[PDB]
Symmetry: C6
Subunit: 60 residues, 6 copies
């Protein structure tokens, strides 16, 4: 899974802001800190997300 790990990598690398739409309706406005197999960390209060409640992600 390169093209997906790599986006996050290049977006933790440049601090770049992001909306993560959780399957809840949770539009999470943050800057990505880190990721790992099961989760992502978002920086607003911090809010670690489970990559599994993830519908879709976009660069703002």
């Amino acid at each position: 899974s390169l093209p997906s790990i790599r986006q996050l990598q290049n977006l933790i690398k440049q601090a770049a802001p992001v909306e993560i739409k959780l399957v809840t309706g949770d539009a999470i406005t943050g800057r990505v800190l880190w990721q790992d197999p099961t989760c992502v960390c978002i920086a607003d209060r911090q809010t670690t997300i489970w990559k599994q409640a993830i519908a879709y992600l976009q660069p703002k």
Copy 2:
């Protein structure tokens, strides 16, 4: 998984348009740019979809 990967592969090769219905209820209109084990990328603003929120896909 050839029958599905060949559909995404022949649709990123055509830039053919597509709706992807998410499990939130999201209809994601756009053209497919890449796929991987976990994501699809549509282009209309770019939006990478976790393939795991996907209900269904239709060519338009």
Copy 3:
């Protein structure tokens, strides 16, 4: 997983019509084209489904 692969097999083999109830409320009225590990293809516009948004399926 014989008794499930086999139903689809015998229903792609006879073109036989089918309602697939997605966990969304999406009653998909089609005729099944193919399947494979992760998805099903339904023929109405085509609509590939992720076997994972699948609640239940019935022969009409």
Copy 4:
């Protein structure tokens, strides 16, 4: 998975009636005809359930 498979096995062996509550909210009243790694089959019209939409099962 013996405790669960023995319950479905002793219920298809009795044709005992059953409700299966789906994660859509569906109550599926019927008698169990087969099971497999992914499906259960109820008989009331037949409806094969993806075992993955199952909330819970009760003998009636």
Copy 5:
């Protein structure tokens, strides 16, 4: 997975009452009979649950 199997074990061992909140809104009031890889059995009519519709569990 010790600390979770062990709770159920020690709660099937003492018959102890339990509310299991399914991801449906299904607060299941029971006493736990057994468990196994994929499901739990609850004793009210019995109601086998799929450990997968499970949000959270509490001793009453």
Copy 6:
């Protein structure tokens, strides 16, 4: 999974407070007592969460 396990590990080591947002919409306010491959345990009444209903976690 070090980035996530080290966050739960450094939060059970501090008894630091926490909200865990479930995929039901539940906000679970409390302090973390243990974790395992499938569960987290919060303490406010105790409530073990199946980690699989987790949308996201925030330190407060």
